Amino acid sequence: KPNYALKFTLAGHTKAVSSVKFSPNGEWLASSSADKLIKIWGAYDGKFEKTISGHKLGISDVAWSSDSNLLVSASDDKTLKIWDVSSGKCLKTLKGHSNYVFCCNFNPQSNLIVSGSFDESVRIWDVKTGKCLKTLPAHSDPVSAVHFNRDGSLIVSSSYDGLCRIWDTASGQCLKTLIDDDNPPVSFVKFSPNGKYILAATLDNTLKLWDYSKGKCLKTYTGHKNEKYCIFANFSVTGGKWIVSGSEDNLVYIWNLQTKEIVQKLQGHTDVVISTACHPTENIIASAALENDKTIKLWKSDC
Amino acid sequence: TEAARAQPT
């Protein structure tokens, strides 16, 4: 079992925090918020570094480029923005969605961005020009998450329509739809580090690990509360192999990936833990909470 | 203002 202990509390957003992400090089944490701002913090000391501004409405997601130099953000103002982190300047505004942009990610190559929106579509964008390269009629409800696999050759998308779908990045063709009985709303999805599985959250207090090519569900993680919000989950791989998720009972849950036992609950936030992130090289977790809290917390463990 | 992820279904 891990022994995550609270190390820092990062105050400063003036509304709910929506997403936190460590930079691929481990140096930084980026956070997004309903207060329309992105903030950058030191990953190891929690020190505030800068505020990044320009979205016209609140922001639901942020993600880093592979060289840790760019951010992309997804906003209720129906745009994404690409930012130079060092200068804080907006480099490109990606327009084309017709409703809130909810989720975003770069591919490992970081020449593409993928976005999902309340307009039920997934768009794929050229990082260098800002042009929209593909528009996918991906779902019949808001797209809650989009993620590239480890070589950028596939995209997974999830939606309130209850589906996860696997897309061929090059062709835009849908290669697999994952269904599960009554198909409750899928509120999060991401590929596993080895690209063979997907971890999907549904709004019935459940996380599932799927082999998407075999269509088999391999593990189920529960005990937390998730019926209303699109809460990020993670694979933690720097020490022991854990699953990490926020929860609507205001805790961070940590499960053993193989046994599905809850191995730790992290207490400190005073509102829904909407987002967690795992540091790329150290056993460090960042967690972020909604309106009655507005803070980010950094936790550190020996395994 | 507000962000869609910070609002409940």
Residue numbers in the entry:
A (entry chain A): 32 to 334
B (entry chain B): 10 to 18
Show the paper's wording.
It is an essential subunit of the SET1/MLL methyltransferase complexes, which regulate gene expression by catalyzing methylation at histone H3K4 sites.
Initially, we attempted to co-crystallize the synthetic PTENα-NTE116–148 peptide with full-length WDR5 (amino acids 1–334), but only obtained the crystal structure of WDR5 in the PTENα-NTE peptide-free form at 1.8 Å resolution. In this apo WDR5 structure, the N-terminal residues (11EAARAQPT18) of WDR5 occupy the WIN site, with WDR5-R14 inserting into the negatively charged channel of the WIN site, as previous studies have shown.
